[PDB]
Amino acid sequence: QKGSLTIQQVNDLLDSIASNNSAKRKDLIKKSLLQLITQSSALEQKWLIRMIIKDLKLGVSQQTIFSVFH
DNA sequence: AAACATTCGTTCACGTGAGTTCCAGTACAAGTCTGGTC
Numbered sequence: 001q002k003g004s005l006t007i008q009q010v011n012d013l014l015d016s017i018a019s020n021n022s023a024k025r026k027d028l029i030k031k032s033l034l035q036l037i038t039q040s041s042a043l044e045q046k047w048l049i050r051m052i053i054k055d056l057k058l059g060v061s062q063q064t065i066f067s068v069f070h
Numbered sequence: 071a072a073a074c075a076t077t078c079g080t081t082c083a084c085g086t087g088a089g090t091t092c093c094a095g096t097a098c099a100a101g102t103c104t105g106g107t108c
Contacts, residue, residue, distance in 0.1 A: 057101090059101090061100060062101095063100075
């Protein structure tokens with residue numbers, strides 16, 4: 001019901017997944033995904049799946065996010 | 071001298087133009103789903 005991951009850790013794990021896919025090593029992808037699964041809650045994992053597939057469906061336009069930012 | 075007609079300022083109802091609020095139609099842009107091959 002509670003996670004123990006920070007944003008930097010998640011970015012590092014995703015970077016490892018991408019790089020190891022580029023290098024044709026699936027064991028490291030499995031290890032990174034296992035760490036993410038073991039150190040995350042169900043909601044966090046749902047959002048991680050959405051981020052991996054690259055579709056969040058927030059309902060707010062990218063232009064709106066940029067306008068809010070600056 | 072008395073009765074009737076006309077005129078006048080008033081009154082009401084009804085119709086038309088301009089201002090304001092609300093909603094439907096239109097336009098455009100982004101998001102989402104799909105197709106095909108290498």
